[PDB]
Amino acid sequence: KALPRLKQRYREEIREALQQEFNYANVMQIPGVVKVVVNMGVGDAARDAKLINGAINDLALITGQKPEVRRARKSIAQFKLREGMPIGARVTLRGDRMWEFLDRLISIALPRIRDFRGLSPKQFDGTGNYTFGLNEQSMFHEIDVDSIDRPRGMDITVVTTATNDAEGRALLRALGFPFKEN
RNA sequence: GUUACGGCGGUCCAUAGCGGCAGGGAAACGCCCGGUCCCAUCCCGAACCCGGAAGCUAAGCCUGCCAGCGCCGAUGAUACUACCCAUCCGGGUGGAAAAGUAGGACACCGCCGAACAC
Ligand SMILES: [Mg+2]
Ligand SMILES: [Mg+2]
Ligand SMILES: [Mg+2]
Ligand SMILES: [Mg+2]
Ligand SMILES: [Mg+2]
């Protein structure tokens, strides 16, 4: 009785496109998207612990759910990092609100990147999951640019049931990701 | 009773493992569909849990076949050795490896339940 816009498009069009393109023997082999993970690595927090709270608020507004604070598992003197220090914030998106975040990202957030020339199509990890980084948080309309204290980037990974980069690239391409041509 | 069947066990727990090639879906085991309800996430119905049966044997699971990598492994011989001979080195009777070789091996056994036969 409901469906996120991008999910409907996937089930009705993209599945059929992939079956015609790669000619899978079984329908269970059709690649889909499992989860989207958004990670902010505030290494600076190892000294200025106030910074963690900004990264948390930004991710909460961007994704719509409370981040989980990730503690350092390993002391390292060069970074002034002690084990157990809160040094990262992560959000795991699944299901309906993963399809909504993806739709907002592809439609609104990515075209707002300053001097956006598309994403590199070579950022796949060999198993056909895609990761890309952002340097700032201003390209999200859920964050008030009037209120940001400091530019806070993040790493966004889309993980896929694709077995290889070619299949995963085709899926994201059909999903509307703006890839460069090389 | 017989089955490419589902469980629970066992073996001084790999001869049973890892891997490769091919195949299986009757009831089961599964992925799978969906969060109204018990319950759940240091975030996420992914997991755990609950309610379902549209799809699929592609994976898990199951069956057949490969000795490629692991694993098991003699016989004999040697090393070592207890006791006894032996003025220096050695030897006799008894026990006897490790390594290597021949080779074995792609497990085997018990209870219950399916489904079908009688
Ligand atoms: Mg059946
Ligand atoms: Mg689910
Ligand atoms: Mg198969
Ligand atoms: Mg012997
Ligand atoms: Mg031996």
Side-chain angles (χ1 to χ4, degrees):
Chain A
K1 306 302 179 181
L3 294 174
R5 181 156 71 100
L6 178 63
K7 200 181 152 136
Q8 191 189 352
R9 187 182 144 198
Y10 171 74
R11 280 185 173 173
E12 298 201 80
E13 296 162 26
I14 301 182
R15 275 199 146 252
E16 302 204 351
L18 294 164
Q19 182 49 359
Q20 291 159 7
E21 172 165 17
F22 291 108
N23 310 103
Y24 299 103
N26 197 287
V27 282
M28 306 299 292
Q29 301 175 316
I30 300 287
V33 44
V34 173
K35 67 185 173 182
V36 172
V37 186
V38 185
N39 171 60
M40 299 194 48
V42 210
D44 290 349
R47 181 177 181 170
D48 289 345
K50 298 176 186 175
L51 295 174
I52 323 153
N53 304 339
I56 290 163
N57 299 345
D58 293 352
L59 285 172
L61 294 174
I62 289 165
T63 70
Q65 59 180 75
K66 199 183 79 161
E68 188 211 350
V69 184
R70 305 303 295 141
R71 306 310 189 83
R73 88 189 86 222
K74 182 177 185 173
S75 291
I76 177 63
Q78 299 283 18
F79 307 146
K80 306 296 184 183
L81 186 67
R82 309 296 168 71
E83 187 171 346
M85 291 194 83
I87 210 66
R90 182 256 254 101
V91 158
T92 310
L93 301 172
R94 304 182 184 268
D96 294 352
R97 59 179 60 198
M98 165 202 87
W99 283 110
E100 275 128 36
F101 175 83
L102 275 179
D103 190 25
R104 275 151 50 238
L105 182 82
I106 293 310
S107 303
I108 307 304
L110 286 187
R112 222 193 190 206
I113 305 295
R114 290 161 165 155
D115 198 19
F116 184 62
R117 306 185 70 190
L119 303 176
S120 170
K122 293 179 179 179
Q123 316 213 334
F124 284 92
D125 53 2
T127 183
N129 310 309
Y130 190 77
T131 312
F132 72 97
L134 297 173
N135 191 69
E136 307 183 325
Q137 80 268 63
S138 178
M139 72 283 310
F140 300 100
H141 282 78
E142 297 88 350
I143 295 190
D144 294 342
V145 70
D146 297 322
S147 61
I148 294 169
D149 63 307
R150 181 177 65 83
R152 288 200 265 299
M154 74 214 68
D155 303 88
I156 304 194
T157 180
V158 194
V159 357
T160 321
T161 60
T163 65
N164 66 61
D165 303 333
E167 295 181 332
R169 188 149 47 238
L171 175 50
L172 292 197
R173 192 177 295 282
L175 211 68
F177 263 88
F179 293 133
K180 295 179 181 180
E181 296 304 312
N182 301 161

